[PDB]
Design a protein around this ligand. Structure first.
Ligand SMILES: [Zn+2]
Ligand SMILES: [Zn+2]
Ligand SMILES: [Zn+2]
Ligand SMILES: [Zn+2]
Ligand SMILES: [Zn+2]
Ligand SMILES: [Zn+2]
Ligand SMILES: [Zn+2]
Ligand SMILES: [Zn+2]
Lengths: 484, 484, 484, 484
């Protein structure tokens, strides 16, 4: 039906929380009121002592990602099952063209894989893995016709996706022109390449070689450069998987001066540290490898959450990019061949809850901002997503702030046989998830429908562009020309 | 009637803006919709090309303040007329007991003056000008019975209102216990007193002696100390009239580490600099005198707005405390006897607009946050105030972002014969103000009703206390006792 | 004789290091040259592969301190033996008047205790434990007649030594007038008192209660306030035992803006952390108690050394204030009655060496600055002390950067039966110490002469006052008076 | 003779100042003593009420620089005359190979031009304008045979000298290996190129187009990147002409964490602001053009001096690169063709004095550090240069802190017919300069000898490399390899 009535709980939006019953009809919220009588035949859910949160939005997923002939184990079906079991009802995945491949053809491939499989709504960012006139031209079609308002370039990955300062400059101008946000994987690629060469030459072949090849100052430098270029163009920039203190500090520094930069920590960075790469077990060590690496500095995750609470970091993704032991073992004598990526789609919200709320770092409202509402505004799908209000989509999570769980591979819903949050006790979990007025997770069991989810288009010139027309006006250099 | 229909404009809340018509019935918003047909006999206002903002909330007013036998010239009637002519539909004024005077008796006096005169809704903070057991006891009655959730102590004014560290500690614990926010006038009082003695001893008697007697480092030091004490108690603190870079930086520093501190710049600090105290005309110079002083550092107001945009400063007050030339002239041979205070209730919003929006520093939504919605949440009157939503109070401002005006005493609605924003050109003004569904400002004319406004109670344990129970839990020192 | 020739070593001053032989005659350096032939009968020391450093200067000692009827176990004889065994040839101790006691009478007592006992040269600071006209007057005699140029006030110790803002202001003006540096024990005394009351009321009686009663934000706040007051007066201020990151950051902040503030970390803060106060053994825990406490934040000592290397902290003292197990046990049911103080006079230099040099944090020259030369300039006894140059005092340490040692009570030369640096392995120690051309430590044995050491007077208006006359000129507020 | 006796003045070194007479014999300081009797026939100079400073060292000169077929107007003869008239007795100039030209052949050319012309001692840095195996190989000969210990690469000048991150990495490793300091012209070259294209396309052809083409964030970004790369290699880096607040802040940030970075402000940055590029007169505007540009932010020069005083910036150069009106006019319709460079060799010290000492920002000793002694240590020519001590070179400046002068082209000793410090009143000037015991400036007149000056070689592995062997040890990544 997509029709359900949720009674006796507390609604929590990012502006306030309050006691109210919520009615969803034909997948849309119809009524919010202190007491809604159940009519004949309507399904009723009890949220006594529980919270109604807008469904989580995961801004950073890589389901079913092709890599070196193999593929990520978590795909669009299993992946979205895991999402809703953890309170996340919307994922944004990355289209990743091969070099010289058309973005439209790559986009077509991605949307076909998803449309068939998704158990919840989704949308897509497009990575700019190579640059040319035709690429520039296909960006316009994506934005105008294919519901895209976000593009991603890489400062890392020399000899493949890496772009230069001159290219990045022009990519950002094109983003500006089309009203798209510009995303950046920000590490100094030339130095990551020299550091990989150095570590392997020293015989440091294990996963720990990964962190040592790329310390956090290379992430902070590249973050700095990408913001300086973006501020010159005068267009919104978005730093994906901000993993380090240094890079977080850079973002805070520039934001303070009024620069239009957004930042995205991820569940791994908020939940674990990089000392697992020094584990004597190779399998365990290699399982935590991703890029940028999870940082071994112990104060890292707390500081990332501090910035998150302040709004100097905006929203939490996962970078969900999962590979099995056998796939990971491709790099057993060479850390550079370990497929990069960890899990998080299922556990993001409970990890954010445990490390943010239960530490006193985040209030309930700041948790909703950090996990749905701000993402929605940034990618221009608010208030359809990320808000419990009349007219908005009936995607809702019944959250129990008092139920405990220890996270383990033995009980997760990922297709991969390892979890980086193994043994971590959390208090506060999703006990029922509702997508389009339908229960898809409840009583510790999934009731998904494969291919239920829909693609959601994202118009250009959203909130991230508010103020920029005026900024362009006041920064006009003709205002500063001397008439001689 | 308190019933009105506003058509063809854009609603602007602090989360998003959108095209919609707004219907107000019996003083409450009834319907928000893209097209509302006017019924028979209903008054219709056109907001074509205009914005519908929640009425401004001024957190810091001193209408009709007794001082040295005389009184502030702007009172509760004329004062609230000026407010609505500038888009402000809610003021919070300070009850100021004399030393040894009952707070309840002082509160009774204040509410009587206001109830008779106000043209818009209001509420009241209570200053703690002296400390004792009975004071502590009357705070409970105020909070429980008299609708107060905010108390103010002074670190300045030696030999009168000043409190010591030990007193401030206990006042904040009492605030914590009652669920009230703790406000602070933060200057080092002992040093302000020695600096006044020094300046006058040097023969520096003019208004410029005022700034020199109290440079900004005394404000920053006292701000620092008040937050450290408040963080130890673990209770929300609120820094009133943050006038300086140094004090703003201190607040940012502590907030970053997760300290629960709020800050309030004022219209004067956002709109002018303290170089007017060096004006060769004594009258002009003395007219800008207030405490803390307006700062002569030119980069001050821009930096205050930067912090405001970031949310490191929360909301804008006025410290509206107006005196005429004759009153100001009491201190003609002694700056210490110049009655302290300037205007701003009328011009706050246009000044914030001109310096925030038209500089590119603030978006439209961040302007609403800075002028209504955040104040409302902080003082626990959201979403009744500071939001255009169904069920909320029909206090609305029709804002024209494109109409210009030069501010002058020759056209203002203050009772005082001087304006600190004289000659300042602003673009973006309130063209119609609506309080409780009734037009009170339109077509450049007032149509107020004296004593129309109501007192609005403010429950304790509002948003400013979210997270604190958990913080108390995790900071519990018994968790850190060694069992020997 | 006080005559000795040191051959084959490297001289290390704070400006450069170089190979040279050093000749000392009648206690003064006579010649520095690449090759000095030994004459008939002259004693020769070999420093092949070793360094010649200026004798260490310990700016902060409390030998033989009266406390609650008992006395510190390390006195002026045993204490100075321990100093030279560790490479320190000059101590500055604090005269501490009782409240209402004459400073001159207290000074007389101190100098009598020392003159009889010291094995190396010394001098004395005077604490201002109470304030009055007569105190102000005795400060002038001390500075003019008794060789003192440094005075100390307390912001902590409510109901005893604590001074208010108004008193501190006037004490600093008096210091300014007399050309003395103003030292400050910087903790918020009112809050330390409320925190002690709170901890004991919770039943947290052990040493860990000490840290919890006084977290580092109370040190940082008081440091901040003391510098703001000192900058207003325009006179040099010196922060003793800077134990925390927060307080170090405050000093860096102000110094950057050009404020005349100096800071003194101590060997304990550079060498250990406060987690020893949570030791399950009461004796061990209580042994690390001092004020301000050693901080449990693990990154503390590294950050203190970073600032030291930068010159944002100037020189290292010890706060050597030692008590035996039996004395410590006075506070067995009450941490507030544990006599405050730890050891360090012997181990300061090796601890600074191990944590500064061997970490790569300090060069050899920066080590000499941090342990002698900067102290000497600050307290105006340079280049007589803290430099190997012709004409300078023949106090020299033969340092072996390659000899290792584990520090222990079983081998130290302190009179106390406990060492806070127990079990710490250091590489780089003093192997021979020379005071006034005489060997007092060599071949792991003492050869001191009791009462050999002399009192060294310290003229007012030293280096710490360079620039201040010009600062007073440019800050003259009459330059900013408006002529009306 | 090179023999002179200076009586009645105060010696000022960077560690202390003191009254003493100084005797120079055969060009070397022979005796320093409170009273030196003049023998028969010895020349005596009176420095009653005056200061004896070590001769100024200018680390950054471009005398006689070939540019676009023309040459800088100040050459090695006239240039060194101007230097000594301003108290500077040592210049370090840059050898600048054309692309594909041998460094040795370029070095040979430079040394030939200088040896014939210099009136005071000099030495040479070598710019790395292109990178190859042979270049790498010629660096070794320069360091081992030709007395060079400093090399310079460019991050600006796309399509000519610019180097990439990968090249810069390898250049710094080569510097490390040879014990040379690595200098960096730090602006983002790709962005400077796009900004030049943009400004000219907008029709902004005047000198103001220069600043607008290259705001300070491009200097701060490139400064940041060069330090991150240098810190990874673990070798000393030196930022030349630090012109901006942003870039100064970056250096402070990294230095704090212990990074081995040095910074060089220049006299123009310390003395004037970039608002002269907006002068309505084209000639005046174009005369202030250099790269990076002088910054129009008014608080710039004060903040640069603050950092200088702190030692976060080390020493002052000039970037003396002078062109006449006719040469400047090459870019009359195109700011990109204006030959870049301003004057400063003559006025550096008085400008530093006026803005540093007379503001209260620098003491006398910190002025000597900033103008000679620190440069000498950094480029490894201390204490031969930058110190008044026995054995050191008899290059001395008699400084009058009380003599005033207004700077003008009508009285300077530059060959160019314009001065950027025109009309600036300074108090404190060089009244007599002495090079190698000979008077070369006195009684407002030059008495130089052309080709008197000598080339001074600079050994590798100087002070800038102290600590680095230990840093390499502790940073060894093999210490962090997991043994599996
Ligand atoms: Zn990435
Ligand atoms: Zn990714
Ligand atoms: Zn106030
Ligand atoms: Zn007020
Ligand atoms: Zn103390
Ligand atoms: Zn002490
Ligand atoms: Zn350059
Ligand atoms: Zn240059």
């Amino acid at each position: 039906t997509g029709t359900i009535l949720i009674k006796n709980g507390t609604v929590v939006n990012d502006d306030r929380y309050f006691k109210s019953d919520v009615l969803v009809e034909n997948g849309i919220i119809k009524e919010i009121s202190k007491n809604i009588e159940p009519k004949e035949g309507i399904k009723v859910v009890d949220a006594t002592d529980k919270l109604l949160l807008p469904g989580g939005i995961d801004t950073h997923t890589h389901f079913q990602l092709p890599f070196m002939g193999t593929v990520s184990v978590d795909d669009f079906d299993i992946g979205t099952q895991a999402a809703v079991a953890g309170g996340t009802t919307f994922i944004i995945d990355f289209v990743i063209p091969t070099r010289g491949q058309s973005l439209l053809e790559a986009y077509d491939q991605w949307k076909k894989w998803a449309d068939e499989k998704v158990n919840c709504d989704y949308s897509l960012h497009v990575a700019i893995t190579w640059w040319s006139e035709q690429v520039s031209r296909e960006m316009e079609i994506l934005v105008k016709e294919r519901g895209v308002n976000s593009f991603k370039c890489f400062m890392a990955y020399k000899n493949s996706f890496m772009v230069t300062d001159q290219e990045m400059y022009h990519i950002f101008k094109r983003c500006k022109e089309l009203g798209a946000i510009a995303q950046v994987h920000a590490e100094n690629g030339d130095m990551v390449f020299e550091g990989q060469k150095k570590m392997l030459e020293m015989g440091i072949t294990g996963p720990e070689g990964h962190e040592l090849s790329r310390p956090e100052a290379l992430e902070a430098e590249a973050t700095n450069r990408a913001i300086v270029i973006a501020d010159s163009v005068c267009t919104p920039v978005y730093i994906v998987h901000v993993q380090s203190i240094g890079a977080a500090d850079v973002i805070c520094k520039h934001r303070k001066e009024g620069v239009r930069v957004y930042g995205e920590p991820i569940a791994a960075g908020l939940g674990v540290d990089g000392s697992h790469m020094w584990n004597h077990d190779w399998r365990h060590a290699a399982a935590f490898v991703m890029g940028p690496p999870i940082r071994p500095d112990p104060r890292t995750k707390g500081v990332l959450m501090d910035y998150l609470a302040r709004g100097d970091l905006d929203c939490v993704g996962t970078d969900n990019c999962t590979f099995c032991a056998d796939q990971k073992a491709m790099g057993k004598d060479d850390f550079t061949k370990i497929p990069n990526g960890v899990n998080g789609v299922e556990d993001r919200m409970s990890i954010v809850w445990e490390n943010g709320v239960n530490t006193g770092k985040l209030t309930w409202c700041q948790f909703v901002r950090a996990t749905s509402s701000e993402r929605a505004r940034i990618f221009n799908i608010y208030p359809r997503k990320g808000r419990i209000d009349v007219g908005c989509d009936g995607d809702i999570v019944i959250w129990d702030p008092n139920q405990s769980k220890t996270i383990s591979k033995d009980t997760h819903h990922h297709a991969v046989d390892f979890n980086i949050f193994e043994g971590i006790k959390v208090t506060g979990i999703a006990v029922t998830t509702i997508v389009a007025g339908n229960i898809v997770w409840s009583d510790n069991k999934l009731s998904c429908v494969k291919g239920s989810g829909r693609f959601v288009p994202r118009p250009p010139f959203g909130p991230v562009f508010d103020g920029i027309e005026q900024r362009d006006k006041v920064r006009n250099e003709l205002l500063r020309k001397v008439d001689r």
